[PDB]
Write a protein that binds this ligand. Structure first.
Ligand SMILES: N[C@H](CCC[C@H](N)C(=O)O)C(=O)O
Ligand SMILES: N[C@H](CCC[C@H](N)C(=O)O)C(=O)O
Ligand SMILES: N[C@H](CCC[C@H](N)C(=O)O)C(=O)O
Ligand SMILES: N[C@H](CCC[C@H](N)C(=O)O)C(=O)O
Ligand SMILES: N[C@H](CCC[C@H](N)C(=O)O)C(=O)O
Ligand SMILES: N[C@H](CCC[C@H](N)C(=O)O)C(=O)O
Ligand SMILES: N[C@H](CCC[C@H](N)C(=O)O)C(=O)O
Ligand SMILES: N[C@H](CCC[C@H](N)C(=O)O)C(=O)O
Lengths: 193, 193, 190, 191, 190, 190, 191, 190
């Protein structure tokens, strides 16, 4: 039943601020949706999402600034992409862009699985549990990966993440759970092979 | 295969500092364990746990202070019990005590399920996903629960958590995955009906 | 059953049954799709299963108490438990009224198996939900060392099982959330 | 586990059933550990301890063994309460109980009482839990009020049918002796 | 089948069929989803399957008897059993009419397998529900040890299988409870 | 069974059995897990199941023939089929000797069901693998429309079922590939 | 979906097989939407579009329909390549393919080639993928080198056996016409 | 297959096959439990399946190339794809050599189905892994609008499928982690 934000695309290299600015522009003000999709949004926020984040007011009075804090709570601070960003701005921004469209745990689990494959049979760091949750272990794994592979590793991990997402879009489009025009555009703007 | 710390009990009302101090005393220095249990510990830390948290040194040189930071990363900061503690010291301390014996996600999922039952058909706050992960939504749910039920609610939620843990200990003891003397002692010191 | 209101913790058998007869007092007719007619909280099927062949309108308060005692006390043999521990018997009776007597008796047997120390003190019981000589002998041997402490710990263990069961029932909408909150609240102690 | 060692004549009493076990399994008899191990008067170490005998198994008297058999196969299953309503049904449940475990024949007994209650006109359906309590006793009382002595004999033959078919299934899995099953049909089945 | 009335214990083949032809005599309507209308207890499907290509109204009592004997006597080869034991053949025929012939024949083969010791008197039969030379040879070798006792014991064993099956059918509402009670009653002996 | 050699297409019952008695003549050892030693192709289990209580060494060729005819001809009731069509009976017998008699009989019943239109010529048979009055009546009504064509077509249909089954057996290594190739080769026609 | 509308004589060529489809399904024929909808020269809208005809279905010529049948039932399955090695096997696969879809008979063909390779002495086992490529062609080449014309006839009769048994299973689920199956055994089965 | 070393991105068919023949050069004997003898990277089974009946020691480099082209080019019909798009054909060939040709062809078909716009541009293909007229016609219609862009996007989509497949293979220890890291590294672009 979960409303995310698979409504448009931001250019590659876009920051957290630009990702959330693009959601607040493309989904600005009141937009109706069916009850089975979280119902109507104000600045992209459903009543359930607003209440889950502690907005107890009338949804017609929700300001753009309050909506931004709610987006940041669900898609940046909640999943601890602020902590990822201290180690790698580009990995944090990629996880955030995929998180707003699929929900943050999806790309984080792919992230953990890819860090496990690149740890060289656990010589560089031990295998993570793919729980979808950024904590000290995942952050330490990313730190040791980037110490050994440097900036080449960063770019490779982003491409690896794009591969996981691309194949997920194939499976969703096949079950009619993703728009085919959207998936074609995503590959054109986000996939760097 | 996962080494936690179900080795002893701390008195009810014990703080985070006392919970971790008791682990460092009862599991002080080198203690051997079979390879299928994470192998040997130094200050209760396995080689895998130390490496996962970024200790790259020799396990015989791991200081008590470094071990404390590793325990706090896995059982306090990692699961965000520091954020829970800002709202309720007693709920954070209870989650921490159960977390060191079963692994933090177990008690956190029970915590989320109990907050869902006490939200009165989603009038006070919407249902959480029981993902085992403390983030803004779970913290906002605890904030609204404690605003409506006050200190009585806090104590009731701790007792509810004890019930979930007690029944889990029955199921573990039945599969020989928990010591029966330990479970008898746990009910005597921790269960306040 | 009768999950219809909270009884003070540690209520005796008589108070448990008195509280049912008060909260559900008096002949109240209902259509066939709602158990048919009730009297003193007894359904037509419960009365007939216990040998009342009369009109439900003529069921006396005294006959209703006998039926309750048969289904929730003598039937499950809590009279025999009470000879060893009136407190454990009263706790099994209160839970039995809410869930059906076999549920708490099975938790009781499973907990006695955990505390039998790898079968040194007594062998493992079958968790059949039936109080007989073996379950009674197991409770007797458990209480043999530290009677005071053992009784209190076993009741705390039964509360843990029942509390987790209330979580699972509330999650399936088979228990009222206010009831479950009140049930824990009544039992909070230091 | 149980006592499938011999047969007693049709119409044998509870006292005769237990006396026959104490004679055919009298004193020490060795058995392998995977069968409860050695018996004294037919009692395993586990059975004696579960019934509160804490002594040495070599000092277990015939009389203590009889109390343990009665606890497991008569008083525990509440066949004493059945016997007040029908001595012949109680004796038949007890004879089968000592061979199979008392819960097996009691469940068949409840299922047959449910069939003979005529779509719940005479009494409501029992839960077939294998446990004798006031409801099962009340159902037997109402069955025997409407069917009288004919019903009592009919219910015993119905139980014999359930037990006979169970012996077929057990013999097929090698969990019952075939000579025993042939002798059991010969002595006990009256249909 | 023909579960319609109780026949005295030990009825012959002729009496089993005579009883069906009397209790279901002439035209009797039944709903289309249950084989539709019967003449002398024979459905159109049953008649056609046995080579009756005429009109149901013109089906004689004598033609109906042949169809019954084909489906419940000659088809299952009970004529060959009858050469060895008329009383076993009559028992299998009575049960076959009620349940379908393969049910009692498989019980028959399973019981012959238990009474062959450990394949010392004869080897285990496949319980296929089909009477053939091996099943006939097994009955012959079983009866060569204590004929009267064996026949009596094997009929008692078959009665046990059939009685338990009546419990299972009554429980699924596929057999009338009065029928089952009357069936056991007719067979009670000392 | 007897998968041991290819017999000319359309061999009679007598020739099918004669070929088994020649290719497996006298004493032949086989491992205990495969029925053990044969005399005239008869295992001790097969002999005893058919009432031979003597010594295997004293089993005559003539006694072996009777056992073969009981298991592969009279038991499956191919004698009754032979009255309607000797060529269908001979085909079922040859396949029965190779696969066990119930396999080809069930294919036979399934094919009769397809060629009954929509139950217009005769009703659907249960594919139980048992030859009885209904299967015989269905073959009689099938053959009453174009006897020669029908017999030929039904034998072709049976050949199709059996050939596909040989593919499945060869794939599981339960049939020799040279055998299967030779089996089809013998039956190739224009 | 396919063309189970008629039979052609034994020994019919690919040209005759396709000519027979174009005659029995000539011009417009209505069919319900749940069966691919209406045909022109036996071609559905979906079949024509999948083969690159972008025009109006009413303007589809007999000759364009023939190219579409050949694409789906001859060139696509590579029966042209089979035909170089054996015209008679290619024609038999094509006749079955037009009724069932070409992959069904090709898989049976591969499974029978695996049985006749004599435990992989003459050629190794094929994957039964339903697809004609160099391996399946090489296996047919080596089979026909060791078995010659007898093998070719034997492999066709083996295919007929697989198809006949498949018709039994389809007729039983009401997915094939019984008169058609009877006529198919009569005309095509030569065993 | 040949997952044995990395080829530069966009390598042609000839370079893919040249790189196999260099990295796996020359007759190298192995025991029967390791594929037996290899020559130019061809196993005994691969050579025999492609019609080489000679001694593996005499296999020429030219014969090895023909076998590779049969299994990884002409066999899967990448020669026909190449007429429409040499770039897509080369990418399917490179993936086919590593995984088996049906894997990338099935991803290719599934991606063509996603980009057919709810079947407005061409109907959905069966993802059978077989390049035939329908798959070729679908690629032709896809490339009909924005040939340049479509080709590049379809190759990026195939890289996504193959990259995720390498994750799953590395997780089951069926792909080398250094290989997978190098495979992505070779393909990083801006
Ligand atoms: N695997 C840990 C928790 C993992 C937390 C992980 N998601 C992190 O990145 O810290 C455990 O059971 O102790
Ligand atoms: N349920 C959210 C994530 C829940 C995070 C939760 N564990 C928290 O307490 O913030 C979602 O899919 O957007
Ligand atoms: N003898 C029984 C044990 C269960 C009786 C038990 N519920 C009790 O007495 O407490 C049996 O072997 O099946
Ligand atoms: N076997 C018991 C009845 C079990 C009680 C159960 N029927 C309920 O009250 O839920 C008896 O014969 O009294
Ligand atoms: N006369 C036997 C037939 C069994 C044949 C079967 N045992 C086989 O040969 O496979 C019977 O009485 O069923
Ligand atoms: N002669 C039939 C017997 C079928 C009997 C079965 N159709 C039934 O009555 O239940 C046959 O040829 O198998
Ligand atoms: N059906 C194809 C063979 C498929 C290729 C496959 N056998 C592999 O190389 O993995 C053919 O007849 O050539
Ligand atoms: N007609 C085939 C479609 C698949 C052929 C395809 N793989 C191609 O040509 O690309 C069928 O109906 O089963």
């Amino acid at each position: 039943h979960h409303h995310h934000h698979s409504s448009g695309l931001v250019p590659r290299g876009s920051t957290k601020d630009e990702i959330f600015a693009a959601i607040l522009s493309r989904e600005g003000g009141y937009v109706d949706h069916p009850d089975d999709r979280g119902g109507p949004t104000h600045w992209g926020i459903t009543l359930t999402t607003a209440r889950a984040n502690g907005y107890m007011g009338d949804m017609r009075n929700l300001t753009r600034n309050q909506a931004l804090k709610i987006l940041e709570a669900d898609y940046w601070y909640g999943p601890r992409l602020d902590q990822v960003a201290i180690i790698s701005h580009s990995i944090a921004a990629e996880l955030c862009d995929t998180g707003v469209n699929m929900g943050p745990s999806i790309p984080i689990k792919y992230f953990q699985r890819w860090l496990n494959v690149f740890n060289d049979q656990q010589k560089i760091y031990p295998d993570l549990i793919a729980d979808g949750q950024i904590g000290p272990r995942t952050l330490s794994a990313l730190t040791f990966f980037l110490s050994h592979r440097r900036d080449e590793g960063e770019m490779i991990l982003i491409r690896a993440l794009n591969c996981s997402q691309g194949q997920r879009y194939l499976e969703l489009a096949e079950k009619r759970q993703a728009n085919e025009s959207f998936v074609y555009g995503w590959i054109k703007e986000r996939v760097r092979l």
